[PDB]
């Protein structure tokens, strides 16, 4: 297996905690957030078969980032990833998205065709959702949370000179979907589409994990978050948080 690489998180990962309107205030919130200036892991897909799709822990929430030039990247979430338990499948088809919750039997290499080669059997289906697709080079960022019997997705998409490090700037992730599923999640995996040879590509992504922390957020007159500070980052920010 290829060695892992790390990159600085910078000021990324801030999302809207709740659904309440706040304008021209400063609010202190204790919630699950990505700590500032943390190290995140970086996954490559480089061409005795290649194993570039590991199975990773979910913990208490996941921050996912992709900088793909073309669309190679859906997801699988679950506990056992077999037929003994239920799993969540998200697939981004060319025209529509499909979200399903069933008992699946997933293959050893769940790849896609540029289609249903992800599972051999799917029984006991208890959820099904179809909607618009989630969609130069662009940076697409997602935050996945699983709390009180609800799966919450937050998304952001920003058009991009140097791609070596994640950009230094502030942007807030906006709510996308709140699925009312009731399953337990401890593992997750990513799906890659392989074009048939007459297969790899520039598929790189970043994964990070959230922690319980207290943040101070600034709201503007229109309800948009403009600045945020981490209380436990440094002694200088402690004075600002204490007030």
């Amino acid at each position, epitope marked *: 297996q290829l060695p892992p690489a790390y990159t600085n998180s910078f000021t990324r990962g801030v999302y809207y905690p709740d*659904k*309440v*309107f706040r*304008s021209s205030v400063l609010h202190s919130t204790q919630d699950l957030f990505l700590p500032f200036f943390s190290n995140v892991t970086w996954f490559h897909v480089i061409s005795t078969k290649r194993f570039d799709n590991p199975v990773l822990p979910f913990n208490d929430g996941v921050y996912f980032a992709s900088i793909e030039k073309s669309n190679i990247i859906g997801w699988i979430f679950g506990t056992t990833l077999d037929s003994k338990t239920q799993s969540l499948l998200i697939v981004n088809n060319a025209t529509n998205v499909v979200i399903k919750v069933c008992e699946f039997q997933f293959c050893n290499d769940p790849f896609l065709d540029h289609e249903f080669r992800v599972y051999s059997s799917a029984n006991n289906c208890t959820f099904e959702y179809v909607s618009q697709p989630f969609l130069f080079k662009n940076l697409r960022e997602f935050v996945f949370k699983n709390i009180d019997g609800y799966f919450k997705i937050y998304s952001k998409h920003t058009p991009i000179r140097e791609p070596e490090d994640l950009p230094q700037g502030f942007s807030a992730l906006e*709510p996308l*979907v*709140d699925l009312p599923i009731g399953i337990n999640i401890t593992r997750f995996q990513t799906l890659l589409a392989l074009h048939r040879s007459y297969t790899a590509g520039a598929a790189a992504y970043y994964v990070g994990y959230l922690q319980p922390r207290t943040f101070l957020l600034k709201y503007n007159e229109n*309800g*948009t978050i403009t600045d945020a500070v981490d209380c436990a980052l440094d002694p200088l920010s402690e004075t600002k948080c204490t007030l």
Partner: nanobody, 120 residues
Framework: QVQLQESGGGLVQPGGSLRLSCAASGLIISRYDMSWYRQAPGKERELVATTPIPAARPQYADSVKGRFTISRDNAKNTVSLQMNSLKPEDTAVYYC?????????????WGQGTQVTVSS
């Protein structure tokens, strides 16, 4: 600088069909749970309709079931209510703002409003 303007209303015969539109400036609908409110002479204020975040269904009131439909156009910041048949005792003024779960303690804002009346 939040500003809400409601349009669509007036005098109609019983059991008509009306489309009320809400234009919001300074606010992004995609982030909040919006609602439709109503107040009547001597009736104080009572909730009418609610439209939660996607992957959830609308929740009406018990006495208004099966008579209104709601829509949410996020691209142009529009909330619309489509009116089915109604009893003549539904004449009132209708307001458009955030839902009960999207309001703080210090929120006192209400737009102009629209009048709807059923002529019997």
């Amino acid at each position: 600088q939040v500003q809400l303007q409601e349009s669509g209303g007036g005098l109609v015969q019983p059991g008509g069909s009306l489309r009320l539109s809400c234009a919001a400036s300074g606010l992004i609908i995609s982030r909040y749970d919006m609602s439709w409110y109503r107040q009547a002479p001597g009736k104080e204020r009572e909730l009418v309709a609610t439209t939660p975040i996607p992957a959830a269904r609308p929740q009406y009131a018990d006495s208004v079931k099966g008579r209104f439909t709601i829509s949410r156009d996020n691209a142009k910041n529009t909330v619309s209510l489509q009116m089915n048949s109604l009893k003549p005792e539904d004449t009132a003024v209708y307001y458009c703002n955030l839902g009960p779960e999207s309001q703080d303690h210090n929120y006192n804002y209400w737009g102009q409003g629209t009048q709807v009346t059923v002529s019997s």
